Amino acid sequence: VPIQKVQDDTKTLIKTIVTRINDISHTQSVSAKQRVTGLDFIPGLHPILSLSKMDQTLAVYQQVLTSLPSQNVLQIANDLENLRDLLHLLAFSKSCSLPQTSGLQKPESLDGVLEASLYSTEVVALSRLQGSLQDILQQLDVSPEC
Amino acid sequence: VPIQKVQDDTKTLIKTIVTRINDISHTQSVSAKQRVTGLDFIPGLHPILSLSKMDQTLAVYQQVLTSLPSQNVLQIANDLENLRDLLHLLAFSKSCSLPQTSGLQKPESLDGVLEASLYSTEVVALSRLQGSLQDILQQLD
Amino acid sequence: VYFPPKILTSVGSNASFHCIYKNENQIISSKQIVWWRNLAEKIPEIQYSIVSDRVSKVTFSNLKATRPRGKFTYDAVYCCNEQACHHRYAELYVIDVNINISCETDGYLTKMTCRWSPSTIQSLVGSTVQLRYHRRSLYCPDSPSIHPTSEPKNCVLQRDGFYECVFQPIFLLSGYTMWIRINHSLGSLDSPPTCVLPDSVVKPLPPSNVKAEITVNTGLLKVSWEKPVFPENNLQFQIRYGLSGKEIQWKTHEVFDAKSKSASLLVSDLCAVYVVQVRCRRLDGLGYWSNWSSPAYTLVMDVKVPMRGPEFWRKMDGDVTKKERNVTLLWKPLTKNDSLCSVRRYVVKHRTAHNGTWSEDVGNRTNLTFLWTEPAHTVTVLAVNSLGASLVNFNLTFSWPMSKVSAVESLSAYPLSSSCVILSWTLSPDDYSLLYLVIEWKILNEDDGMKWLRIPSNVKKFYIHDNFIPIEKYQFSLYPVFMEGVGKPKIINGF
Amino acid sequence: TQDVVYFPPKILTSVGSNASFHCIYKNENQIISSKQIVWWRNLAEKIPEIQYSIVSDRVSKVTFSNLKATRPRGKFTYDAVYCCNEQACHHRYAELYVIDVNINISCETDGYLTKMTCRWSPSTIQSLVGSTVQLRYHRRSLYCPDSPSIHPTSEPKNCVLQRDGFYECVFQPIFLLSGYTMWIRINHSLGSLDSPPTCVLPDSVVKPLPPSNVKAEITVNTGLLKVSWEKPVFPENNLQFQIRYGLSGKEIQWKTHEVFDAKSKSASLLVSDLCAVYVVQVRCRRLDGLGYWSNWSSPAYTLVMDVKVPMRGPEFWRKMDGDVTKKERNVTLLWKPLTKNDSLCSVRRYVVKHRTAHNGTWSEDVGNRTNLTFLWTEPAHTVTVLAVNSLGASLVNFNLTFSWPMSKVSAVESLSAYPLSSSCVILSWTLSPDDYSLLYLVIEWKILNEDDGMKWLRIPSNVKKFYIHDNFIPIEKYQFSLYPVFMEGVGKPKIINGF
């Protein structure tokens, strides 16, 4: 499989996930000013540059999403695991080996914060994932490092 | 009833019977050259001449058909008994007063081969009775 | 003595058999065994084999589907000595297994719907069907294969005779290897495996917000539509358009540009209602075509003004001694070529030396009656639609001095038949600026069977086609026309 | 007891049957003498005295005969007969129920000889409330008996009413030659009644399937439609076939015919037209008359084919295009399509054969065109137009020759035109006394100054006066040309302009 086709498919999945996040966000009209403490475990909007960090932060987001009781969020997590598969495929295409991000311990704060606010955590996680995923789409255009 | 009508009606019946066996046996075309064991009690290997032999043989064909569970075969057995009644009346018309002794069947091999070789039983029965019907057709004149 | 007594296999394989013939208390050699199927065909010796002196082996090849023979679903094969056959036999079963599976992706990318029909299975009673699948996280391989780890799928037989299989939620980029599993009392078989990628079978939603319009002053059928939501927006669009009526003569146009939201098409008639529908599929051609969009209907507006003002003629009622004479203007509705789409109102313009010019909106009427008093009066009828009046309009000037001018020298009428009459005339040699000539005719003593026709001044011989009754007397009048007004007409009665 | 005693009180009987009642009328405390008692039916019809019978001084009897079916009267399905002292009718009555036992039995046997179906109409049983319908049949070993009768032992059989309002029930398996005696049995609180039983032989009510593999064609040389078919497999007895044929269109005016020889699987019938498409259907039934017609066959369409070579060649003429001084002259041959009689069915192509003394003879295929233009260069040139269908050219064809030397031979002496009307003009002429072997004459006319008002007519050489029927306009000037035609070519024509 040509590397260009893999990159195009990854961009397709980026666009589709951004679209579905927008679709659920339209149904969830939440003020962005709601500052909820204890959410430091969700990756922040920071410059993400190399593919290893892509896989790591996406696995973190998927673990956060998997804990949400929403079925659409579950299918989003399915899309995230598929996108990790394609990120690893891109890693093989560039002769780089992403570390197997299977050792992320389940965040102990998930149980304490989801019970406090399932809905607000879902909203903020979706927003931060969407922003990070546009960050990825921009980086994928500029040949991100390993 | 006049005898000529009896005769022509019998001819019509027997040719209907052979046409029916032909139009059913088309799906079961067989080679008469092959001989099977255990079916000696099914006749048809000899020419048929006299009244009593016809009656006994057709009673045998009756009983062997009755053992077979097919609706078409049910109608065939019905027609066989019809033509047996016809031949009994024809014998009465021949002005021969011979006592009518019929029956005398010992069909346990019938049951064994029935539970053994259903397909073989039906095909050999139809073929042999078909041949016997043509032979008695020639003998009829 | 048979081994084995019954065999299961599918179309396209070989076969092998073993027989031991037992007669009385003796066993014959295998060199005399004669094989037969259905007691009707002697199997060629080349298919036979002698593995042992007492065992006869027969091998088949490329076995074909069996044709049902009454209640039986199998054929009986017989291993016989010479012509002596044992009553026992074997059993064979073939069954067709090649079954096609039809799947579609919903337009909302939530569910997988697979369908298939058990028609080939209907001939077997006692057989139980189960659908077995294995999903690959990667894409489908070139050669689908039955994976050892398979899963059962529940499918509902619909009224159509097809089983429908609903899978949800979905994984578009995951390969889905599929094959049918049948389970009879004698065992189980499998259909040829197939793998389907959900992305490749997407049927998009029908296009939305289909708006049809004929662009003004151009006559181009412009359509605007809203694109249904799709990944990459890589959609190939198909537009069908046709006349609005009992039968829509649908014409089609394709829009290759996936970025195009509106397009314009030429139409022959600018004044007809049209029906347009749009369907879309993936730009690469994969998946299905979407449902045809809702029909958009064009509204009949006036794209342009009428092209020519109606041709009109006057009727003179009023005594000759009277200077004031009422004038009745007679014109006709514009044709669809002249009215374009419609004529909304008739406005008759006037021209005088003293009162100057003015116009009278006659409305939808094709007649306007007015009094004539001034020596010089020019008139002109205009046809006005929603966009304005017509461009080219006929003028007609009335003059007292010019009416006394006699420009027609001779006149002759010749009836060709009840359907045609020849008109003959000779002009005066004077250099009259004849614009044209008006043949004006009616039945004598009839004041309402009135007819007239303009002809160019260059014509010398003219033919009139009408229902002419020879008994009736016809009055014929030809009028010379100029800048200043009409000259003195030539009038004859009869032929 | 009661003041009025009807014994038996209620009676059920059939049409035409005889029934009788008895009354004992008590008025107040006195029993009315039987001689003072009058009967009344539904209190609307007094029963006549002649039917009165006296059992005793207190018991009087009336015996209805040849009874007719009771007409339902609103909610009353019975005829109420009243025991009346003269005019004193007591409010109670006896109820008489009369039904028509004549229920026709319609039976059918399929062409497969495996299903027996029968129907009957319940058209009279509605007038009996609470009546239970049942079919009872009995099988005779062989044949139906001479006089049908109800067997003491019979077998009930359920039958179903369909939307047609008829009762439906069948038999399977069936006895081919066993008499079936059946009847309709009714059951009610007043007893049971039976229809007059009829016996049916299953073999006499058999109708077959339509005969298949019917083919139709037109005989090329004779002209009779050739049709072949195949008898249905069952029944095997000799059958008679009826054949119907007609034209193709919205309506078909069929014509009927029958064949009696069963052995004949082919037929031939006279026709009126050959080049149209006919439709034909056949049906079969037993020769003796037993059974029924087998509906009809599927419609069949014939194929139009050129039956024979065209019967005559087309009549043709020529147009001179070329100066008199020029020796080479264009010759535009002009003819018309063959009529249905002349073309028979079709003319596939026009082949114009030529003949010269130098180039011999050759033919030109003009296709479907009715005109042909060629240059005249030889002094002698014979031309013959051939109409060719699929089978070949036409048998006898018209010949025309062109010759420079005899083109100066003037054979026509006079030429006069007389207009009868706008629709007819007389042509009159006198001939030269020379012994000219004139084949025929050609009348060629046009409107003067009109180059496309070409019209022409060939007329026999023996004619001396001719009448032309065409739309003539007296105003227009007409040029008239009469051409003397000989074996060697066409002679010098005579030309006049106008009348």
Short mmCIF file of N, CA, C and O in Angstrom, two decimals, chain D residues 264-325:
data_model
loop_
_atom_site.label_atom_id
_atom_site.label_comp_id
_atom_site.label_asym_id
_atom_site.label_seq_id
_atom_site.Cartn_x
_atom_site.Cartn_y
_atom_site.Cartn_z
N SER D 264 -55.47 -36.80 -38.57
CA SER D 264 -54.90 -35.65 -39.29
C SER D 264 -54.41 -34.63 -38.27
O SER D 264 -55.20 -34.07 -37.51
N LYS D 265 -53.10 -34.40 -38.25
CA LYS D 265 -52.51 -33.35 -37.43
C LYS D 265 -52.18 -32.10 -38.24
O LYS D 265 -51.52 -31.20 -37.72
N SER D 266 -52.60 -32.05 -39.50
CA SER D 266 -52.34 -30.92 -40.37
C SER D 266 -53.63 -30.52 -41.07
O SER D 266 -54.55 -31.33 -41.20
N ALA D 267 -53.70 -29.27 -41.52
CA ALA D 267 -54.91 -28.76 -42.14
C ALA D 267 -54.55 -27.69 -43.17
O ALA D 267 -53.48 -27.09 -43.12
N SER D 268 -55.48 -27.47 -44.10
CA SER D 268 -55.37 -26.44 -45.12
C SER D 268 -56.74 -25.85 -45.38
O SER D 268 -57.72 -26.58 -45.56
N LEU D 269 -56.81 -24.52 -45.40
CA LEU D 269 -58.08 -23.81 -45.58
C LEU D 269 -57.91 -22.70 -46.60
O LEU D 269 -56.82 -22.13 -46.73
N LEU D 270 -58.99 -22.39 -47.31
CA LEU D 270 -58.97 -21.32 -48.29
C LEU D 270 -58.82 -19.96 -47.60
O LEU D 270 -59.22 -19.78 -46.45
N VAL D 271 -58.24 -19.01 -48.33
CA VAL D 271 -57.99 -17.67 -47.82
C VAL D 271 -58.53 -16.66 -48.82
O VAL D 271 -58.83 -16.97 -49.97
N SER D 272 -58.65 -15.41 -48.35
CA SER D 272 -59.04 -14.29 -49.19
C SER D 272 -57.89 -13.33 -49.48
O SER D 272 -57.80 -12.82 -50.60
N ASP D 273 -57.03 -13.08 -48.50
CA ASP D 273 -55.86 -12.24 -48.69
C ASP D 273 -54.62 -13.02 -48.27
O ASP D 273 -54.70 -13.96 -47.48
N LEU D 274 -53.47 -12.61 -48.82
CA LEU D 274 -52.22 -13.33 -48.62
C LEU D 274 -51.18 -12.53 -47.87
O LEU D 274 -50.37 -13.10 -47.13
N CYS D 275 -51.17 -11.21 -48.03
CA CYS D 275 -50.06 -10.41 -47.51
C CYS D 275 -50.37 -9.80 -46.15
O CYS D 275 -49.54 -9.04 -45.62
N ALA D 276 -51.52 -10.10 -45.56
CA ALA D 276 -51.85 -9.64 -44.23
C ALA D 276 -51.38 -10.67 -43.20
O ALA D 276 -50.84 -11.72 -43.55
N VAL D 277 -51.57 -10.37 -41.92
CA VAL D 277 -51.24 -11.28 -40.84
C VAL D 277 -52.54 -11.79 -40.24
O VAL D 277 -53.40 -10.99 -39.85
N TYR D 278 -52.69 -13.11 -40.19
CA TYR D 278 -53.88 -13.72 -39.62
C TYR D 278 -53.61 -14.22 -38.21
O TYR D 278 -52.47 -14.45 -37.81
N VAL D 279 -54.69 -14.40 -37.46
CA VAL D 279 -54.65 -14.97 -36.12
C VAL D 279 -55.52 -16.22 -36.13
O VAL D 279 -56.58 -16.23 -36.76
N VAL D 280 -55.06 -17.27 -35.45
CA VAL D 280 -55.71 -18.57 -35.53
C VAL D 280 -55.63 -19.25 -34.16
O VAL D 280 -54.63 -19.12 -33.45
N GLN D 281 -56.70 -19.94 -33.79
CA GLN D 281 -56.76 -20.69 -32.55
C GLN D 281 -57.55 -21.97 -32.77
O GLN D 281 -58.44 -22.03 -33.62
N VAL D 282 -57.23 -22.99 -31.98
CA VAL D 282 -57.84 -24.31 -32.12
C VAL D 282 -58.25 -24.80 -30.74
O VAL D 282 -57.70 -24.38 -29.72
N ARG D 283 -59.24 -25.69 -30.71
CA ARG D 283 -59.68 -26.33 -29.48
C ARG D 283 -60.11 -27.75 -29.79
O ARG D 283 -60.44 -28.09 -30.93
N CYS D 284 -60.09 -28.60 -28.76
CA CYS D 284 -60.30 -30.02 -28.94
C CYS D 284 -61.32 -30.54 -27.94
O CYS D 284 -61.44 -30.03 -26.82
N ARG D 285 -62.06 -31.56 -28.36
CA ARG D 285 -62.99 -32.27 -27.49
C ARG D 285 -63.24 -33.65 -28.08
O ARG D 285 -62.88 -33.92 -29.23
N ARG D 286 -63.85 -34.50 -27.27
CA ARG D 286 -64.06 -35.89 -27.66
C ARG D 286 -64.97 -35.99 -28.88
O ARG D 286 -65.91 -35.20 -29.05
N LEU D 287 -64.69 -36.97 -29.73
CA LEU D 287 -65.46 -37.15 -30.96
C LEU D 287 -66.91 -37.54 -30.65
O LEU D 287 -67.84 -37.03 -31.30
N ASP D 288 -67.12 -38.43 -29.69
CA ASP D 288 -68.46 -38.92 -29.41
C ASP D 288 -69.37 -37.81 -28.90
O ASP D 288 -70.55 -37.75 -29.26
N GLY D 289 -68.84 -36.92 -28.07
CA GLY D 289 -69.63 -35.83 -27.53
C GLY D 289 -69.47 -35.70 -26.03
O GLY D 289 -69.80 -34.66 -25.45
N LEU D 290 -68.97 -36.75 -25.39
CA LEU D 290 -68.73 -36.70 -23.95
C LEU D 290 -67.63 -35.69 -23.64
O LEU D 290 -66.74 -35.42 -24.45
N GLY D 291 -67.71 -35.12 -22.44
CA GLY D 291 -66.76 -34.11 -22.05
C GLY D 291 -67.08 -32.75 -22.65
O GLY D 291 -68.16 -32.51 -23.20
N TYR D 292 -66.11 -31.85 -22.54
CA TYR D 292 -66.31 -30.46 -22.91
C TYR D 292 -65.15 -29.99 -23.77
O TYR D 292 -64.08 -30.61 -23.81
N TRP D 293 -65.37 -28.87 -24.47
CA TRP D 293 -64.32 -28.25 -25.26
C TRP D 293 -63.19 -27.77 -24.36
O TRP D 293 -63.41 -27.35 -23.22
N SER D 294 -61.97 -27.84 -24.88
CA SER D 294 -60.76 -27.50 -24.13
C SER D 294 -60.41 -26.04 -24.41
O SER D 294 -59.42 -25.73 -25.07
N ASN D 295 -61.23 -25.13 -23.85
CA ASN D 295 -61.09 -23.69 -24.06
C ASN D 295 -60.76 -23.37 -25.51
O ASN D 295 -61.55 -23.65 -26.41
N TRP D 296 -59.59 -22.77 -25.73
CA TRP D 296 -59.05 -22.58 -27.07
C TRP D 296 -57.53 -22.64 -26.95
O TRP D 296 -56.98 -22.77 -25.86
N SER D 297 -56.84 -22.54 -28.08
CA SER D 297 -55.39 -22.54 -28.09
C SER D 297 -54.87 -21.12 -27.97
O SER D 297 -55.62 -20.15 -28.05
N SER D 298 -53.56 -21.01 -27.75
CA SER D 298 -52.92 -19.71 -27.71
C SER D 298 -52.99 -19.06 -29.09
O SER D 298 -52.91 -19.74 -30.11
N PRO D 299 -53.16 -17.74 -29.14
CA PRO D 299 -53.19 -17.04 -30.44
C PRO D 299 -51.88 -17.22 -31.19
O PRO D 299 -50.81 -17.23 -30.58
N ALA D 300 -51.97 -17.37 -32.51
CA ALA D 300 -50.81 -17.59 -33.36
C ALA D 300 -50.76 -16.51 -34.43
O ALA D 300 -51.80 -16.10 -34.96
N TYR D 301 -49.55 -16.06 -34.74
CA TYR D 301 -49.34 -15.02 -35.74
C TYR D 301 -48.56 -15.57 -36.93
O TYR D 301 -47.50 -16.17 -36.76
N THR D 302 -49.11 -15.37 -38.12
CA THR D 302 -48.42 -15.77 -39.33
C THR D 302 -47.34 -14.75 -39.69
O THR D 302 -47.31 -13.63 -39.18
N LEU D 303 -46.45 -15.16 -40.59
CA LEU D 303 -45.38 -14.30 -41.07
C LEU D 303 -45.61 -13.93 -42.53
O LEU D 303 -45.88 -14.80 -43.36
N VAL D 304 -45.51 -12.64 -42.83
CA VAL D 304 -45.69 -12.16 -44.20
C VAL D 304 -44.41 -12.44 -44.98
O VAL D 304 -43.32 -12.01 -44.57
N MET D 305 -44.53 -13.14 -46.09
CA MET D 305 -43.41 -13.46 -46.96
C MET D 305 -43.86 -13.29 -48.41
O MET D 305 -45.04 -13.42 -48.73
N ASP D 306 -42.90 -12.98 -49.28
CA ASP D 306 -43.21 -12.80 -50.70
C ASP D 306 -43.67 -14.13 -51.28
O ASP D 306 -42.86 -15.03 -51.50
N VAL D 307 -44.98 -14.25 -51.52
CA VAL D 307 -45.54 -15.51 -51.98
C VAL D 307 -45.05 -15.89 -53.38
O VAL D 307 -44.72 -17.05 -53.62
N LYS D 308 -44.99 -14.93 -54.30
CA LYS D 308 -44.55 -15.18 -55.67
C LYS D 308 -43.86 -13.93 -56.19
O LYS D 308 -43.95 -12.85 -55.61
N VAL D 309 -43.15 -14.10 -57.31
CA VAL D 309 -42.49 -12.99 -57.99
C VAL D 309 -43.57 -12.02 -58.45
O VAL D 309 -44.70 -12.44 -58.74
N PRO D 310 -43.28 -10.72 -58.53
CA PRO D 310 -44.33 -9.75 -58.87
C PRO D 310 -44.98 -10.07 -60.21
O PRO D 310 -44.33 -10.55 -61.14
N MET D 311 -46.29 -9.81 -60.29
CA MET D 311 -47.07 -10.32 -61.41
C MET D 311 -46.81 -9.55 -62.70
O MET D 311 -46.76 -10.15 -63.78
N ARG D 312 -46.63 -8.23 -62.62
CA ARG D 312 -46.26 -7.44 -63.79
C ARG D 312 -45.17 -6.45 -63.42
O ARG D 312 -45.00 -6.11 -62.25
N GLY D 313 -44.43 -6.00 -64.43
CA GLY D 313 -43.50 -4.91 -64.27
C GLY D 313 -44.23 -3.58 -64.24
O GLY D 313 -45.34 -3.44 -64.77
N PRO D 314 -43.62 -2.57 -63.62
CA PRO D 314 -44.29 -1.27 -63.51
C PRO D 314 -44.34 -0.53 -64.84
O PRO D 314 -43.41 -0.58 -65.64
N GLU D 315 -45.46 0.15 -65.07
CA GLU D 315 -45.57 1.04 -66.22
C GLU D 315 -44.72 2.28 -65.99
O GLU D 315 -44.76 2.88 -64.91
N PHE D 316 -43.95 2.67 -67.00
CA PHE D 316 -42.96 3.72 -66.84
C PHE D 316 -42.99 4.66 -68.03
O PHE D 316 -43.41 4.29 -69.13
N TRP D 317 -42.54 5.89 -67.79
CA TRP D 317 -42.40 6.89 -68.85
C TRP D 317 -41.05 7.59 -68.73
O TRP D 317 -40.23 7.24 -67.88
N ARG D 318 -40.82 8.59 -69.57
CA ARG D 318 -39.52 9.21 -69.74
C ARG D 318 -39.65 10.73 -69.72
O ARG D 318 -40.68 11.28 -70.14
N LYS D 319 -38.61 11.40 -69.25
CA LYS D 319 -38.49 12.85 -69.36
C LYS D 319 -37.26 13.22 -70.18
O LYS D 319 -36.13 12.87 -69.83
N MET D 320 -37.49 13.94 -71.28
CA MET D 320 -36.43 14.52 -72.10
C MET D 320 -35.79 15.68 -71.35
O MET D 320 -36.45 16.69 -71.08
N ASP D 321 -34.51 15.54 -71.02
CA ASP D 321 -33.71 16.64 -70.48
C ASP D 321 -32.46 16.75 -71.34
O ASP D 321 -31.50 15.99 -71.16
N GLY D 322 -32.46 17.72 -72.25
CA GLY D 322 -31.35 17.86 -73.18
C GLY D 322 -31.74 18.55 -74.47
O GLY D 322 -32.87 18.39 -74.95
N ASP D 323 -30.82 19.33 -75.03
CA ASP D 323 -31.11 20.08 -76.24
C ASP D 323 -31.31 19.15 -77.43
O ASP D 323 -30.74 18.05 -77.49
N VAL D 324 -32.15 19.59 -78.37
CA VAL D 324 -32.37 18.82 -79.60
C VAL D 324 -31.08 18.69 -80.39
O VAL D 324 -30.77 17.62 -80.92
N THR D 325 -30.30 19.78 -80.49
CA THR D 325 -29.03 19.73 -81.20
C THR D 325 -28.04 18.78 -80.55
O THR D 325 -27.29 18.11 -81.27
#
